[PDB]
Amino acid sequence: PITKEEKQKVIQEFARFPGDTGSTEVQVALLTLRINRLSEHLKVHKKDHHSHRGLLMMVGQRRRLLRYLQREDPERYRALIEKLGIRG
Amino acid sequence: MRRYEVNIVLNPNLDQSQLALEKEIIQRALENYGARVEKVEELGLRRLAYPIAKDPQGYFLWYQVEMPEDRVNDLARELRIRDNVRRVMVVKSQEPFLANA
Amino acid sequence: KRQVASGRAYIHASYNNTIVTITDPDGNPITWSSGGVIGYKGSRKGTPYAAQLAALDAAKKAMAYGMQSVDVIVRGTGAGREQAIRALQASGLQVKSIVDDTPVPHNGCRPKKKFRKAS
Amino acid sequence: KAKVKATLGEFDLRDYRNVEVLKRFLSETGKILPRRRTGLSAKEQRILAKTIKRARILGLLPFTEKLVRK
RNA sequence: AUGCGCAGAUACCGGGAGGAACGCCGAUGGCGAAGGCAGCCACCUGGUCCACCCGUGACGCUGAGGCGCGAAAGCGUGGGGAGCAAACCGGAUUAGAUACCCGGGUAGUCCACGCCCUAAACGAUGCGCGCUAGGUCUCUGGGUCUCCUGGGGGCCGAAGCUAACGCGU
């Protein structure tokens, strides 16, 4: 899965400041871990459609957050996709 | 890497040598797969509630172990290629839920 | 023929017939009987009375081998279960102990339309 | 009747080796007893059914018995 | 009655092979968006509920088209094949019986991969949010644990609604 220290690594890695757990960039990073792990799972378990529905939803929730950032701060919006390597 | 309970039921007709040969064949496999061993409990001879491999009884091993989760299947796979190995039942360890006081 | 002091009486009690087999302590048949083995034919072989005749026939045939007591093992639920049992008790031939061991799948094969009507 | 919970003190109903306790939860035909009879709660009985089954696979408990004196 | 049985069947005991389905637990129970999901074990993975009140700062709702999922039966390729069973082959029944009952039986039911895209796919009730008495049973959290307080499942039913039947936090 995804361990507390794995998560915590990624939170720190992205947090806008010390103690930030809920920023738009933290959220988008945490989502991306999940999507990536989940994507790996599904390339091997092609049949597991119930999970693939989870995936569609995460991806949705990602794209929505990104649209938000992109509109509030086209700058850190660009920072986040460089760092993550996605949406384009 | 998480904590499990390895159950083995062994053939009940073994002299100290054939018996402790199996065991060392087991401790081998166990190590070889990543399992350090917390507690143990050799309860050996117990009377089965139904005949297993034609036999009215079976010999009971019980390790408690930590090991890498992804090997746990592959271990018990191997663990049971032996003939005097009659059951391998490996179970994720668990908080002891209780009733009555 | 061999002496078998005691052994086993199997009642196979179906809706359509009752058969009784009597075996030595190891379950090898000694003698048997049934509704057909007595005079009856078809429908009557069911009937509690057929059961009686058959149990009695099987017992008397078996006392011939000097058999004197038996364990009973019943299988099925069928018009003649208990007559077959009461018959062995009343046959002389001492009944040591009755067990029901009717088989039952732990959910297994699809049954015939006949025994499925509960959908 | 009596309730099979009312006959015991603390027992780990996740302990699939304790045949002496675990066994008191089966019928004479060796079938998992209803809660009507066990006097456990839903949650508990769920964990019991799970542990008994384990015991069974291990050979320490019956799947069935023959009913005596029918 | 067809049928099976003296090439010894039925019943009974021992050994083996195989396929399919999981008794009791089992619920008026639970999970999932639906279809749907039930022996046990591991691993991979989806959703969701509670407490803390810590982070972001309206980032929300819905959703034409698109894309994905979608019971059964059916289609293709390759396996499998125990039991069941359209068709079909017989036996009865009948005024007749291309049926109901009985004995057989192929496709199919099972697996893998690719199709099909349907249904009484039903709560015959689209999705979200706010508001408007209560009682009682229940699953699952939390608390100061008579109870109080979330989230599910039920029934009775304030106000109200309804052609009525009913519906009714």
Side-chain angles (χ1 to χ4, degrees):
Chain A
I2 33 263
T3 35
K4 204 196 92 255
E5 335 88 72
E6 277 176 305
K7 190 130 92 112
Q8 277 301 340
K9 145 88 185 177
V10 166
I11 307 184
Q12 259 115 63
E13 192 38 56
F14 282 84
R16 287 288 277 341
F17 48 85
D20 160 29
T21 46
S23 82
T24 296
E25 25 277 290
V26 171
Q27 258 157 79
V28 166
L30 263 28
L31 270 272
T32 313
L33 188 44
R34 295 202 59 217
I35 285 163
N36 287 323
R37 286 259 195 296
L38 200 263
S39 252
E40 232 60 36
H41 167 57
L42 292 201
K43 182 267 140 86
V44 125
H45 292 120
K46 260 112 179 157
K47 278 327 202 183
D48 178 6
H49 302 122
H50 291 60
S51 298
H52 165 90
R53 201 224 172 192
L55 176 55
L56 279 194
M57 269 174 20
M58 282 173 319
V59 165
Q61 188 59 24
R62 191 156 77 181
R63 271 175 49 258
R64 210 125 16 69
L65 256 28
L66 277 135
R67 200 189 283 114
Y68 168 77
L69 188 67
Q70 216 267 312
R71 164 171 43 95
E72 290 321 320
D73 197 335
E75 203 32 72
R76 55 195 176 90
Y77 167 81
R78 256 177 278 110
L80 196 51
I81 99 275
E82 321 309 350
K83 197 154 209 215
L84 291 165
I86 37 164
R87 219 223 207 194
Chain B
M1 77 147 198
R2 323 160 212 176
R3 180 172 302 284
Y4 301 116
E5 297 171 31
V6 191
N7 297 264
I8 290 111
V9 183
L10 283 174
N11 192 321
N13 313 313
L14 303 164
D15 40 54
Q16 294 294 54
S17 33
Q18 305 155 320
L19 179 163
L21 154 87
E22 293 300 342
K23 306 196 59 180
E24 61 171 289
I25 305 168
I26 278 151
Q27 325 273 337
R28 265 184 193 95
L30 256 130
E31 282 190 59
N32 224 56
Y33 277 103
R36 338 172 310 85
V37 197
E38 247 69 36
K39 263 196 299 312
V40 58
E41 278 182 60
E42 192 168 0
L43 257 73
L45 221 73
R46 294 214 97 80
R47 81 185 353 108
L48 303 182
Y50 59 92
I52 293 179
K54 326 272 194 66
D55 214 293
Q57 280 171 345
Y59 197 84
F60 279 74
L61 266 31
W62 182 83
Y63 313 125
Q64 189 184 298
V65 339
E66 189 164 295
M67 65 171 297
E69 63 261 307
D70 36 299
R71 298 266 288 193
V72 62
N73 278 121
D74 210 359
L75 164 154
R77 207 212 87 264
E78 162 81 291
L79 211 304
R80 68 174 121 234
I81 220 316
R82 311 288 298 150
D83 323 78
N84 302 269
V85 170
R86 301 190 160 175
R87 293 278 201 257
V88 179
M89 210 219 231
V90 193
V91 149
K92 221 190 267 67
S93 293
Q94 257 161 292
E95 196 89 293
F97 198 97
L98 37 73
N100 275 329
Chain C
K1 202 59 207 195
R2 176 164 50 102
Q3 292 307 56
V4 264
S6 61
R8 273 138 50 167
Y10 285 108
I11 310 174
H12 174 284
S14 95
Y15 271 103
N16 254 341
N17 203 343
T18 312
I19 100 92
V20 200
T21 41
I22 292 163
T23 73
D24 66 324
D26 262 16
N28 308 280
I30 272 313
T31 47
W32 62 284
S33 201
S34 88
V37 134
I38 320 325
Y40 288 132
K41 269 231 210 165
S43 25
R44 277 132 5 150
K45 309 198 287 250
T47 72
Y49 188 61
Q52 200 188 293
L53 292 186
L56 295 164
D57 187 35
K60 153 256 135 110
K61 274 196 229 214
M63 289 182 292
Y65 286 50
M67 171 109 49
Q68 276 188 301
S69 71
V70 272
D71 296 78
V72 190
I73 301 132
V74 341
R75 298 226 242 261
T77 40
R81 283 258 296 289
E82 248 83 358
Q83 262 299 17
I85 328 208
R86 258 118 51 187
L88 306 205
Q89 269 156 351
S91 81
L93 169 66
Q94 174 212 118
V95 170
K96 268 105 77 87
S97 43
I98 305 152
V99 135
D100 189 303
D101 183 54
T102 301
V104 4
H106 289 357
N107 267 257
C109 311
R110 172 179 260 219
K112 343 180 91 259
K113 189 245 206 63
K114 203 224 272 198
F115 306 95
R116 256 189 91 263
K117 321 279 303 307
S119 304
Chain D
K1 234 289 90 200
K3 305 272 195 234
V4 182
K5 178 185 156 80
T7 341
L8 295 83
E10 101 162 10
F11 58 99
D12 180 11
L13 60 176
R14 168 118 24 150
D15 185 23
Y16 51 96
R17 301 185 296 166
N18 187 272
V19 180
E20 315 68 30
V21 166
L22 287 148
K23 162 167 31 72
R24 209 181 297 190
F25 282 98
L26 300 142
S27 73
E28 23 307 321
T29 356
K31 310 191 203 165
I32 294 175
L33 286 154
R35 290 174 47 202
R36 212 284 297 170
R37 277 275 307 97
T38 64
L40 292 57
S41 67
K43 183 182 189 164
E44 279 168 343
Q45 178 100 5
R46 271 214 298 308
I47 346 210
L48 177 89
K50 204 87 157 196
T51 67
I52 265 162
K53 274 167 219 162
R54 270 144 146 205
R56 283 182 177 165
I57 289 152
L58 248 26
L60 301 162
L61 273 168
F63 296 95
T64 18
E65 244 63 86
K66 21 249 165 299
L67 186 74
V68 190
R69 85 191 201 282
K70 230 281 167 224

